[PDB]
Amino acid sequence: MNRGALIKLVESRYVRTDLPEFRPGDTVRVSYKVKEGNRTRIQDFEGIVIRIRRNGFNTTFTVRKVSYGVGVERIFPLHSPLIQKIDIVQRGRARRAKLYFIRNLSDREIRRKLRADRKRIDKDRAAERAAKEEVQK
Amino acid sequence: MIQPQTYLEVADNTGARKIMCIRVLKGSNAKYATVGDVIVASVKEAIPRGAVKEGDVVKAVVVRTKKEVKRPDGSAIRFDDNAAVIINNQLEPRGTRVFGPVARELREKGFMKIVSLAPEVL
Amino acid sequence: MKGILGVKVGMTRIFRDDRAVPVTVILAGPCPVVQRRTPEKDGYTAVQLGFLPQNPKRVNRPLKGHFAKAGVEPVRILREIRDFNPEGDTVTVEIFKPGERVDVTGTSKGRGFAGVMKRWNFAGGPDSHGAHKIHRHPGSIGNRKTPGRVYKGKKMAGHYGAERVTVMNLEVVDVIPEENLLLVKGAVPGPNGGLVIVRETKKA
Amino acid sequence: AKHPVPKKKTSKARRDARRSHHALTPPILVPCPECKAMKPPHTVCPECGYYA
Amino acid sequence: RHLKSGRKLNRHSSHRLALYRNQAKSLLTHGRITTTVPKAKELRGFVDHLIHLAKRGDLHARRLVLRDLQDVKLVRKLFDEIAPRYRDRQGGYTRVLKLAERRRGDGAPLALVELVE
RNA sequence: UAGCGAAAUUCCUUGUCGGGUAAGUUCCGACCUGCACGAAAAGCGUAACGACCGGAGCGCUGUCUCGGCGAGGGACCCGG
RNA sequence: UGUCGGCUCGUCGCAUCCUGGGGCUGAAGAAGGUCCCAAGGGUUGGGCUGUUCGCCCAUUAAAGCGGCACGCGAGCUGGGUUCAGAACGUCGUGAGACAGUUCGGUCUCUAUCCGCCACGGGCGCAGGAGGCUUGAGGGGGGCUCUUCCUAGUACGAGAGGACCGGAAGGGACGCACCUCUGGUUUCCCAGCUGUCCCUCCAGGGGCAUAAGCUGGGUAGCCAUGUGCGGAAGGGAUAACCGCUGAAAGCAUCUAAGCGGGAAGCCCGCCCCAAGAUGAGGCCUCCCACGGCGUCAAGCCGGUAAGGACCCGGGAAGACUACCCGGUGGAUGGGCCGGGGGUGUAAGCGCCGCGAGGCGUUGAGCCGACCGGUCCCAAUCGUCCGAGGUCU
Ligand SMILES: [Mg+2]
Ligand SMILES: [Mg+2]
Ligand SMILES: [Mg+2]
Ligand SMILES: [Mg+2]
Ligand SMILES: [Mg+2]
Ligand SMILES: [Mg+2]
Ligand SMILES: [Mg+2]
Ligand SMILES: [Mg+2]
Ligand SMILES: [Mg+2]
Ligand SMILES: [Mg+2]
Ligand SMILES: [Mg+2]
Ligand SMILES: [Mg+2]
Ligand SMILES: [Mg+2]
Ligand SMILES: [Mg+2]
Ligand SMILES: [Mg+2]
Ligand SMILES: [Mg+2]
Ligand SMILES: [Mg+2]
Ligand SMILES: [Mg+2]
Ligand SMILES: [Mg+2]
Ligand SMILES: [Mg+2]
Ligand SMILES: [Mg+2]
Ligand SMILES: [Mg+2]
Ligand SMILES: [Mg+2]
Ligand SMILES: [Mg+2]
Ligand SMILES: [Mg+2]
Ligand SMILES: [Mg+2]
Ligand SMILES: [Mg+2]
Ligand SMILES: [Mg+2]
Ligand SMILES: [Mg+2]
Ligand SMILES: [Mg+2]
Ligand SMILES: [Mg+2]
Ligand SMILES: [Mg+2]
Ligand SMILES: [Mg+2]
Ligand SMILES: [Mg+2]
Ligand SMILES: [Mg+2]
Ligand SMILES: [Mg+2]
Ligand SMILES: [Mg+2]
Ligand SMILES: [Mg+2]
Ligand SMILES: [Mg+2]
Ligand SMILES: [Mg+2]
Ligand SMILES: [Mg+2]
Ligand SMILES: [Mg+2]
Ligand SMILES: [Mg+2]
Ligand SMILES: [Mg+2]
Ligand SMILES: [Mg+2]
Ligand SMILES: [Mg+2]
Ligand SMILES: [Mg+2]
Ligand SMILES: [Mg+2]
Ligand SMILES: [Mg+2]
Ligand SMILES: [Mg+2]
Ligand SMILES: [Mg+2]
Ligand SMILES: [Mg+2]
Ligand SMILES: [Mg+2]
Ligand SMILES: [Mg+2]
Ligand SMILES: [Mg+2]
Ligand SMILES: [Mg+2]
Ligand SMILES: [Mg+2]
Ligand SMILES: [Mg+2]
Ligand SMILES: [Mg+2]
Ligand SMILES: [Mg+2]
Ligand SMILES: [Mg+2]
Ligand SMILES: [Mg+2]
Ligand SMILES: [Mg+2]
Ligand SMILES: [Mg+2]
Ligand SMILES: [Mg+2]
Ligand SMILES: [Mg+2]
Ligand SMILES: [Mg+2]
Ligand SMILES: [Mg+2]
Ligand SMILES: [Mg+2]
Ligand SMILES: [Mg+2]
Ligand SMILES: [Mg+2]
Ligand SMILES: [Mg+2]
Ligand SMILES: [Mg+2]
Ligand SMILES: [Mg+2]
Ligand SMILES: [Mg+2]
Ligand SMILES: [Mg+2]
Ligand SMILES: [Mg+2]
Ligand SMILES: [Mg+2]
Ligand SMILES: [Mg+2]
Ligand SMILES: [Mg+2]
Ligand SMILES: [Mg+2]
Ligand SMILES: [Mg+2]
Ligand SMILES: [Mg+2]
Ligand SMILES: [Mg+2]
Ligand SMILES: [Mg+2]
Ligand SMILES: [Mg+2]
Ligand SMILES: [Mg+2]
Ligand SMILES: [Mg+2]
Ligand SMILES: [Mg+2]
Ligand SMILES: [Mg+2]
Ligand SMILES: [Mg+2]
Ligand SMILES: [Mg+2]
Ligand SMILES: [Mg+2]
Ligand SMILES: [Mg+2]
Ligand SMILES: [Mg+2]
Ligand SMILES: [Mg+2]
Ligand SMILES: [Mg+2]
Ligand SMILES: [Mg+2]
Ligand SMILES: [Mg+2]
Ligand SMILES: [Mg+2]
Ligand SMILES: [Mg+2]
Ligand SMILES: [Mg+2]
Ligand SMILES: [Mg+2]
Ligand SMILES: [Mg+2]
Ligand SMILES: [Mg+2]
Ligand SMILES: [Mg+2]
Ligand SMILES: [Mg+2]
Ligand SMILES: [Mg+2]
Ligand SMILES: [Mg+2]
Ligand SMILES: [Mg+2]
Ligand SMILES: [Mg+2]
Ligand SMILES: [Mg+2]
Ligand SMILES: [Mg+2]
Ligand SMILES: [Mg+2]
Ligand SMILES: [Mg+2]
Ligand SMILES: [Mg+2]
Ligand SMILES: [Mg+2]
Ligand SMILES: [Mg+2]
Ligand SMILES: [Mg+2]
Ligand SMILES: [Mg+2]
Ligand SMILES: [Mg+2]
Ligand SMILES: [Mg+2]
Ligand SMILES: [Mg+2]
Ligand SMILES: [Mg+2]
Ligand SMILES: [Mg+2]
Ligand SMILES: [Mg+2]
Ligand SMILES: [Mg+2]
Ligand SMILES: [Mg+2]
Ligand SMILES: [Mg+2]
Ligand SMILES: [Mg+2]
Ligand SMILES: [Mg+2]
Ligand SMILES: [Mg+2]
Ligand SMILES: [Mg+2]
Ligand SMILES: [Mg+2]
Ligand SMILES: [Mg+2]
Ligand SMILES: [Mg+2]
Ligand SMILES: [Mg+2]
Ligand SMILES: [Mg+2]
Ligand SMILES: [Mg+2]
Ligand SMILES: [Mg+2]
Ligand SMILES: [Mg+2]
Ligand SMILES: [Mg+2]
Ligand SMILES: [Mg+2]
Ligand SMILES: [Mg+2]
Ligand SMILES: [Mg+2]
Ligand SMILES: [Mg+2]
Ligand SMILES: [Mg+2]
Ligand SMILES: [Mg+2]
C-alpha cells in the first residue's frame, strides 16, 4: 500500500520518451494528428513555448503564434498519443519560467528579449552531429 | 465565453467592425456561449456604405474566443480576441470571404462555409 | 450484485484510442469473506467482506475469535455488501470487467461548520450598495405571525461534508489484477487514502 | 440594552440546570519513578528529574 | 474550514518569522530554553535546519544561517562547536520536554527546548 | 406685450414629432389647448466657477453573471 | 402591531403558463380551438420608471395566477412614502397651505424562551463487553428542448407532414471531485526602488501593510474545469377508453365483478434513522461472591472481556465528538530520496575603462505533496469496568 503515488505511476505507461528537450523561451513546432471529416491530417503548429507546466506524466506545455494577424495559443499533453513529432526550431534566452509577458508586446520587441541560447544551440549542433558520428561510424 | 453585453470582433467583410452580444442562442437561459454557438448582436460600429449598418440587429456565430476551449483529446486552444461571423437567418454567412483563424469546432457544428472560407483552421 | 472494498489512491488520466479520459484509481485490494448473512438466521442476504491486513497487537479484542471462526487473517476493516453471495473465499477486482459500470460509496471531505453561502450555494447579499454586515447572510427565514415558526428542513448554516456519499453509474475503464487496481471515471467521494466501497450499478 | 433582551428572569432552577456540565475534573496525576512525589504524565517535574 | 494544509502559528508574517529568529538565537546561546509548548514545538524544526546547515561547511551555508541569526560571533559558536558535536547524527539536534508547570496569570503550559545530548 | 414654454411651473401625461438605444415614464431638439410662465418676490440669455441636481459616451474594474482563495483584528477554546 | 418597492430566503393553493393524460372539434396532416384530469418539477436576460403595474428589446417548453400582517426592515436596502431646509406653479391680506412638482435629509454591536441549523454531556435499552447489520418512521430528487432514423411513409391537390418506435446532442439545476482547463497559494523562488544597519567591497537583514513593489507558484481550498444524477422497472389510480351485465325481453362501462389508463400516488434510486422506551437483530468474547444485607431489592473494596485518562497526530474539528498512532512504534518534527516551484546561488577564473557579460551551472534555494530512516519526541503510569431481578 505505502506508495499510493508509485501506484499512480504504474497506471502510467501511456508515457512517451522520443519527444525532445525544449524549455520555455524558444520556438518549436508540433505535428498534431487531426480529424478532417473522418480521415486524419497532421496539422503543424509552429510557435513559441509560452509556459511549461511540469507534473511528471500529464505535464503540459503551451505554444503561442500569430496566424494571420490574430495571436493563437495551444496546449498539449506532453504525452499525448496525438503528437506525431515535435521538432525544436530555435532556442532562446529565457531568464524566466512562465513568460506570458510576451503577449502584451510581441514584435521587434519580442525578438530582442529572447535572443538566442548560443550556449544550448552549440550543444545542439555539436552533440547532435557528434553523437551521429558514433552511430554512422 | 461570450455573454450579453460582450463585444465581438467581426471576422468578415460583412461591413461591420464590432458587434455587442444581445442574446446567446442556445437553450432557454444559457449563461454563456463559446465557439460554434450563435448569438443575436447589435452592430456597434461599421464600415461606410457596408452591407450592414450600425444599430442593425443581427445573428452571428462565435469563431474565436479569449477563454480557452478544451478538445476532447486533452488539448486546448485560445485566441487573442473574441470574434464572430455575421450570418443569414438560414445560418449561412452573409458577407463572403472571412479572415482570421477559426476553431475546429465549427466543423462539428456544420459551418462548412466558414471553415472553407477560413485562411486557416486551428 | 457484485461488491468489493477499496481505497481511493488518487487520480490522473489515460488515453482511450485517441481521446483522453480522466480516471480515479480505486484499489480494490484482496477481501476475504468473513461471514455470510442468510435469511435462515440473519433475516437478510449479504456478505461480510474484510479488507486490509492487521497486526494482532490491536486485534487483542476477541475479534480474533470472529476471524478465527472463519480461519481468516485478521483484517483492519470490514463491511457488508448486500444481496451478494459470492463463492466461499475471496473477491478481487476481477468481479469487475472493463466496460462494466459501478456505483461507489465514500465519506466526502469534511468542510466543518459551513456558511449557508457554501453549504447550500445560497446567494446572500450585495457586496456594495449597503448594509455591509449581511454579505454572506441568508436573509429572511420565515413570515409574520403565521406560521410563526420555521420549517423542519430549513436550509441553514451547519456541518457540511464528511457525510456518506454514493455516486452513481461510473464506468469501469481499466482493471489491473496484477496489483489490485480499479479504474473508474474520476468523480469519486472521499480524499486520497480514504476507504470506499464499489459495486454493480442500477441502469437496470 | 438594545435589540435582543431576555423576556423573563431565568428561573433559579433553570439557571442551575444550565450549570449542569459546569463542574470541574481532578487533574490527572501519577507517581514518578524518581521521587515518590506526583507528576502529571509526560512531564519533567521538581523533586524528580528525568533521563535524556 | 481551512487547515487541510500544513504548519501552524499565531502573530503575523514578519513578527512571526522574527519570533523564530529571536528564539533560535537564544537557544543557540543558552542551549536550554523554556517557552510555551507551541512556540517550542515550532521552533524545534526551524533550529534543526540551522544546526544541520552549519553541519555543512561552505561559507554559502554559513551566510545562509547568517540570514536568520545575525550575530557573527554567534555563528562561529554554531560552526566551531555546535555543528561539530552533532556530526554523525542525522537530524534531531533538538529535544522538547513538556514542563509540568503552568505560567500564572495566563494559565500557559510551559515546556523545555534543549540542544540535544 | 417682449421674451419663454409638457418647464425646479403640464392634471389628462409616458401629450405628439424628431435624437440617442437592441429596446428610453428619464435625458436632449422641436411644436403650444401655458389645469396653473411672463417681465426687479424681475423676463429671457450668458464666458467662467460648483464636494449642487439630470442625461450620455470612452477608459477601468469583484458593482454584477457569481463566486473562489488568501491575510490580519474579533468571534471559538483555556487562565485572570 | 414600522408603513411601498427592491434584495435574500422561501413555502403553501390551484381557478394550470409549460411539460404529462384525456373527450369534443367547424380535428385530412401539421398546427390550433375548447372543456376535463393532473402540482412533480420548471416558469430566462435587458431598456424605461422609486415604482407595484405596464409598454418595449432579444429569447423560451413556458416566460401562470394567488395566500402566507398585499410573507419576509431584533435579515438587508432606504429610490418613494411621513418631520425640521430650499424652490416652482398654486390658494390665501397674511402666518401658512396642496393624494401638485422639485433638490436635501441619523434604519439601535450582545437572542432569555419557542422555532430552526448543527454538535455534545447524562441516563435509559432489567448480565458486562468488541464488531457487524435490519429498516418502522422520515428526508432528498423528481424540469425540458433540439436534431437524426423509422419516412419524405400514413395524410394531403399541393404547400406541408405525423402517430409508434429507436438513436445523438444541448440548457438550467443538484451531489461529488482536482486528473486536465483555470483561480488563489502572507513568505516557495526570483527581480526592483528608497533607506537604515552587519562589516570597508562583495554578500545579506529590517522597513516601506496588517506581503514595500513586481514576475511566477505545489498541496490545500475551488469553478470558468471534471464525472454522475433526473430514470428504468413493479403495483394501485385520475379524467377517460373498453369487456362481461341486470334492473328494464332491447339497450347501458355498473349496480355484482374485470381489463386499459398520467410528469401525478405507492414502491424502486441516494441520505438519516432502534430515545422505533413498541430501545430490534447476527458473529465473537468475559463469567459466579470475595464482604456486610437471613428473609427483599440493595450495599462494599477487589475483578474479567473491555474501556478510559494521558501523550504524538489527522483531508475529523468552533469546543466536544469521530478517526489513526503510542517503542511490539514510522504518529508528528528532523534528516535523506523523489515530486514540484523558481530559473544558472555564493566563491573563483575569464572579457569589458565601466554598467555588465561569459564559464563553472538547469546552479543554488526549496512549505503543504509521494516515500524512507528511530536522530527528536509518543517514557513511565493511573482509574473505571459482570459476578448477570422475578415467572
Ligand atoms: Mg471589451
Ligand atoms: Mg448611428
Ligand atoms: Mg440603435
Ligand atoms: Mg435607432
Ligand atoms: Mg486537436
Ligand atoms: Mg479532436
Ligand atoms: Mg451571401
Ligand atoms: Mg475538435
Ligand atoms: Mg449548415
Ligand atoms: Mg481554406
Ligand atoms: Mg469478537
Ligand atoms: Mg444499502
Ligand atoms: Mg435491495
Ligand atoms: Mg471473487
Ligand atoms: Mg449603509
Ligand atoms: Mg447611509
Ligand atoms: Mg450595517
Ligand atoms: Mg446603514
Ligand atoms: Mg448596524
Ligand atoms: Mg420580523
Ligand atoms: Mg404558530
Ligand atoms: Mg486471472
Ligand atoms: Mg500481487
Ligand atoms: Mg463536564
Ligand atoms: Mg536528568
Ligand atoms: Mg501535516
Ligand atoms: Mg520583523
Ligand atoms: Mg511587514
Ligand atoms: Mg528569543
Ligand atoms: Mg518567558
Ligand atoms: Mg525545513
Ligand atoms: Mg565556512
Ligand atoms: Mg545586533
Ligand atoms: Mg406672447
Ligand atoms: Mg416630454
Ligand atoms: Mg428651468
Ligand atoms: Mg413618452
Ligand atoms: Mg421619442
Ligand atoms: Mg426613438
Ligand atoms: Mg423640451
Ligand atoms: Mg384638463
Ligand atoms: Mg398666466
Ligand atoms: Mg402674475
Ligand atoms: Mg413684480
Ligand atoms: Mg432671479
Ligand atoms: Mg433660464
Ligand atoms: Mg448657463
Ligand atoms: Mg457646491
Ligand atoms: Mg464653494
Ligand atoms: Mg445606459
Ligand atoms: Mg477620451
Ligand atoms: Mg463605460
Ligand atoms: Mg482569519
Ligand atoms: Mg476556533
Ligand atoms: Mg466565548
Ligand atoms: Mg382542476
Ligand atoms: Mg380555463
Ligand atoms: Mg397539458
Ligand atoms: Mg392534429
Ligand atoms: Mg385537445
Ligand atoms: Mg419621482
Ligand atoms: Mg421577464
Ligand atoms: Mg409567491
Ligand atoms: Mg390588504
Ligand atoms: Mg389581505
Ligand atoms: Mg409587505
Ligand atoms: Mg430597519
Ligand atoms: Mg422596508
Ligand atoms: Mg420591504
Ligand atoms: Mg441616505
Ligand atoms: Mg428620487
Ligand atoms: Mg427619501
Ligand atoms: Mg423638526
Ligand atoms: Mg397672492
Ligand atoms: Mg390636486
Ligand atoms: Mg426627491
Ligand atoms: Mg447631499
Ligand atoms: Mg425626497
Ligand atoms: Mg460590531
Ligand atoms: Mg444577533
Ligand atoms: Mg440559548
Ligand atoms: Mg452526526
Ligand atoms: Mg461529562
Ligand atoms: Mg447523547
Ligand atoms: Mg422507508
Ligand atoms: Mg419518499
Ligand atoms: Mg420529497
Ligand atoms: Mg420538494
Ligand atoms: Mg425525410
Ligand atoms: Mg412530399
Ligand atoms: Mg431522407
Ligand atoms: Mg417538400
Ligand atoms: Mg397518401
Ligand atoms: Mg401522394
Ligand atoms: Mg405549391
Ligand atoms: Mg416539406
Ligand atoms: Mg453533437
Ligand atoms: Mg497551488
Ligand atoms: Mg533593501
Ligand atoms: Mg542586522
Ligand atoms: Mg528598523
Ligand atoms: Mg537589527
Ligand atoms: Mg509597520
Ligand atoms: Mg504576486
Ligand atoms: Mg497567477
Ligand atoms: Mg457550477
Ligand atoms: Mg459551463
Ligand atoms: Mg441516480
Ligand atoms: Mg447532466
Ligand atoms: Mg442528463
Ligand atoms: Mg434519467
Ligand atoms: Mg406497468
Ligand atoms: Mg396496472
Ligand atoms: Mg384498488
Ligand atoms: Mg367497443
Ligand atoms: Mg348481456
Ligand atoms: Mg323503466
Ligand atoms: Mg342485454
Ligand atoms: Mg361494479
Ligand atoms: Mg393488471
Ligand atoms: Mg389498470
Ligand atoms: Mg444506514
Ligand atoms: Mg444503526
Ligand atoms: Mg409503531
Ligand atoms: Mg474466575
Ligand atoms: Mg455463596
Ligand atoms: Mg452474608
Ligand atoms: Mg490528543
Ligand atoms: Mg486533538
Ligand atoms: Mg488508542
Ligand atoms: Mg504507555
Ligand atoms: Mg507519516
Ligand atoms: Mg505528517
Ligand atoms: Mg523533503
Ligand atoms: Mg513522486
Ligand atoms: Mg527535482
Ligand atoms: Mg523542476
Ligand atoms: Mg552565470
Ligand atoms: Mg543572489
Ligand atoms: Mg555565480
Ligand atoms: Mg579588468
Ligand atoms: Mg541537480
Ligand atoms: Mg549543495
Ligand atoms: Mg543540493
Ligand atoms: Mg527536495
Ligand atoms: Mg525557508
Ligand atoms: Mg537504516
Ligand atoms: Mg414461565
Side-chain angles (χ1 to χ4, degrees):
Chain A
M1 169 49 59
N2 276 309
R3 59 195 203 159
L6 183 43
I7 304 306
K8 262 146 56 179
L9 286 149
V10 186
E11 271 55 30
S12 300
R13 73 191 170 191
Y14 304 62
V15 334
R16 286 324 165 202
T17 164
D18 47 278
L19 333 140
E21 303 170 356
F22 67 119
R23 55 195 197 187
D26 59 10
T27 162
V28 23
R29 87 191 142 212
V30 339
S31 331
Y32 211 84
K33 305 172 187 189
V34 189
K35 47 174 301 178
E36 210 75 285
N38 71 307
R39 67 145 176 163
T40 285
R41 268 286 316 146
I42 35 83
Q43 161 198 308
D44 285 327
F45 196 68
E46 190 184 315
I48 300 81
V49 48
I50 249 42
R51 151 257 287 250
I52 295 192
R53 158 200 175 280
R54 299 197 205 263
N55 182 23
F57 173 77
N58 75 215
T59 167
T60 54
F61 70 105
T62 98
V63 201
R64 169 155 208 268
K65 83 175 202 172
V66 197
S67 156
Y68 296 74
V70 153
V72 185
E73 293 178 33
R74 258 185 160 293
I75 298 78
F76 313 100
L78 197 269
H79 295 111
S80 180
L82 277 152
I83 327 169
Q84 192 178 54
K85 333 164 313 209
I86 160 199
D87 310 19
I88 100 87
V89 318
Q90 169 60 211
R91 309 206 166 188
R93 186 69 189 167
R95 210 71 167 88
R96 181 153 296 94
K98 265 84 269 185
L99 46 63
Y100 319 79
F101 80 89
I102 86 98
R103 286 174 192 160
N104 280 302
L105 219 168
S106 86
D107 48 303
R108 188 174 78 177
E109 284 297 334
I110 209 46
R111 329 265 193 282
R112 42 96 81 202
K113 210 62 174 162
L114 309 160
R115 30 272 167 182
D117 214 318
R118 290 170 178 199
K119 183 177 175 303
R120 278 186 299 153
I121 298 172
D122 293 332
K123 284 189 185 179
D124 281 74
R125 313 300 164 177
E128 220 173 55
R129 308 196 190 185
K132 287 161 193 172
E133 272 289 21
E134 325 295 46
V135 179
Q136 308 158 26
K137 273 74 181 186
Chain B
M1 50 190 59
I2 288 70
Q3 86 200 23
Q5 227 70 50
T6 307
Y7 269 53
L8 293 269
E9 225 67 308
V10 184
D12 56 343
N13 53 19
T14 301
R17 283 318 143 196
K18 292 179 194 167
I19 85 279
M20 154 195 288
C21 171
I22 277 311
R23 190 57 187 293
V24 28
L25 278 182
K26 266 172 153 192
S28 64
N29 56 28
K31 263 83 159 64
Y32 337 109
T34 202
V35 287
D37 282 334
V38 294
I39 51 174
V40 177
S42 176
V43 191
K44 290 288 197 181
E45 96 156 36
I47 259 48
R49 57 200 153 268
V52 187
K53 319 79 205 171
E54 288 191 347
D56 276 24
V57 166
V58 300
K59 308 192 183 188
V61 43
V62 166
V63 301
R64 277 188 263 106
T65 133
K66 294 262 282 185
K67 178 68 171 189
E68 60 271 347
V69 203
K70 303 156 64 53
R71 308 288 167 74
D73 46 71
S75 104
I77 201 277
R78 66 170 156 258
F79 310 85
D80 286 348
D81 65 349
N82 287 31
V85 173
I86 291 99
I87 44 192
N88 190 0
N89 219 335
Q90 265 43 59
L91 280 306
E92 304 204 68
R94 281 215 220 172
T96 83
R97 176 207 160 203
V98 358
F99 32 85
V102 290
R104 317 211 92 276
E105 279 71 359
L106 294 146
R107 190 96 183 179
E108 316 182 58
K109 297 300 173 65
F111 290 114
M112 302 291 96
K113 258 277 203 154
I114 346 295
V115 299
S116 150
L117 287 143
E120 168 175 9
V121 171
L122 302 171
Chain C
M1 172 50 47
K2 317 176 173 68
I4 147 80
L5 310 197
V7 321
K8 167 163 177 157
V9 331
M11 69 183 281
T12 69
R13 53 180 198 172
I14 75 91
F15 302 64
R16 214 95 86 93
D17 31 277
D18 285 327
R19 164 165 32 180
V21 167
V23 299
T24 176
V25 185
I26 308 304
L27 170 144
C31 300
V33 48
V34 180
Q35 174 185 16
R36 283 154 192 277
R37 290 276 186 174
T38 76
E40 315 173 29
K41 13 69 170 180
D42 284 298
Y44 67 110
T45 38
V47 157
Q48 187 175 221
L49 258 328
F51 184 29
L52 297 192
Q54 225 310 86
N55 308 317
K57 49 83 187 187
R58 204 98 188 192
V59 202
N60 217 236
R61 302 167 161 186
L63 304 171
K64 201 69 162 186
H66 195 260
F67 292 128
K69 204 254 204 175
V72 202
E73 181 83 349
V75 300
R76 172 155 290 208
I77 262 174
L78 57 178
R79 278 82 201 281
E80 305 182 355
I81 321 280
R82 172 73 102 81
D83 290 320
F84 168 32
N85 186 297
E87 58 67 59
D89 186 54
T90 295
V91 289
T92 21
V93 307
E94 300 281 63
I95 324 165
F96 298 133
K97 155 205 51 174
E100 274 191 307
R101 314 212 65 159
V102 277
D103 296 337
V104 176
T105 314
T107 50
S108 56
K109 282 187 181 168
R111 272 167 274 277
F113 196 119
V116 59
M117 190 96 278
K118 171 200 316 290
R119 211 272 252 252
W120 302 111
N121 286 115
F122 264 39
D127 256 8
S128 156
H129 301 248
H132 210 257
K133 262 219 197 84
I134 37 69
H135 300 300
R136 314 178 51 81
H137 283 250
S140 175
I141 62 181
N143 324 116
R144 278 291 266 283
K145 279 207 68 55
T146 41
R149 54 183 198 97
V150 170
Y151 320 129
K152 310 204 72 177
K154 183 102 255 203
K155 300 203 194 70
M156 311 188 75
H159 269 236
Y160 171 38
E163 45 165 10
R164 165 181 175 99
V165 158
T166 305
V167 83
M168 304 272 80
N169 211 166
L170 277 169
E171 83 154 301
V172 183
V173 180
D174 206 346
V175 35
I176 294 72
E178 281 74 30
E179 301 213 296
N180 283 285
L181 296 316
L182 213 37
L183 260 49
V184 268
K185 279 276 222 66
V188 54
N192 294 179
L195 167 160
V196 34
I197 97 178
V198 171
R199 38 180 154 83
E200 210 171 357
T201 320
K202 300 78 158 69
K203 138 78 176 186
Chain D
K2 266 29 214 162
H3 281 135
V5 164
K7 193 74 178 177
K8 278 311 188 57
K9 173 178 180 180
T10 320
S11 157
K12 61 178 43 176
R14 172 158 263 290
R15 143 163 59 81
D16 297 342
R18 176 190 323 118
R19 297 158 193 288
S20 175
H21 323 100
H22 269 267
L24 307 147
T25 46
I28 334 296
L29 290 190
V30 296
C32 35
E34 303 90 356
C35 173
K36 191 202 168 60
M38 306 283 281
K39 284 195 176 194
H42 323 274
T43 37
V44 162
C45 163
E47 197 79 27
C48 326
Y50 228 30
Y51 25 51
Chain E
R1 42 52 264 170
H2 314 298
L3 194 277
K4 271 61 186 153
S5 54
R7 202 213 196 178
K8 85 181 170 201
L9 44 84
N10 202 297
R11 307 168 156 56
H12 69 69
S13 85
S14 40
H15 179 43
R16 163 167 17 97
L17 157 276
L19 180 76
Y20 298 157
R21 295 186 176 165
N22 293 5
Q23 275 206 342
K25 288 181 161 194
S26 290
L27 198 269
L28 292 181
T29 283
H30 304 306
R32 293 80 197 193
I33 278 301
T34 45
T35 83
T36 51
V37 163
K39 305 189 221 288
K41 282 197 201 167
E42 207 83 3
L43 169 289
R44 186 167 54 178
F46 186 78
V47 155
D48 275 349
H49 159 82
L50 271 95
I51 300 292
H52 186 292
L53 209 65
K55 200 97 88 64
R56 198 217 294 185
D58 52 1
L59 88 159
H60 176 256
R62 197 180 199 80
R63 298 183 159 178
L64 302 196
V65 143
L66 215 273
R67 280 175 190 185
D68 292 295
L69 319 169
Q70 212 83 187
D71 190 351
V72 194
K73 289 175 183 161
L74 206 275
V75 324
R76 295 196 207 100
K77 184 159 182 173
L78 212 199
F79 290 102
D80 315 24
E81 180 181 330
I82 307 300
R85 286 169 46 259
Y86 295 118
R87 211 102 50 168
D88 312 3
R89 178 171 221 164
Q90 295 197 193
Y93 326 111
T94 272
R95 206 198 283 93
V96 252
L97 288 180
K98 334 264 273 61
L99 255 295
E101 161 152 354
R102 280 182 173 298
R103 213 111 139 284
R104 181 225 213 203
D106 83 334
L110 292 164
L112 175 54
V113 164
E114 167 165 316
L115 278 189
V116 73
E117 192 65 334

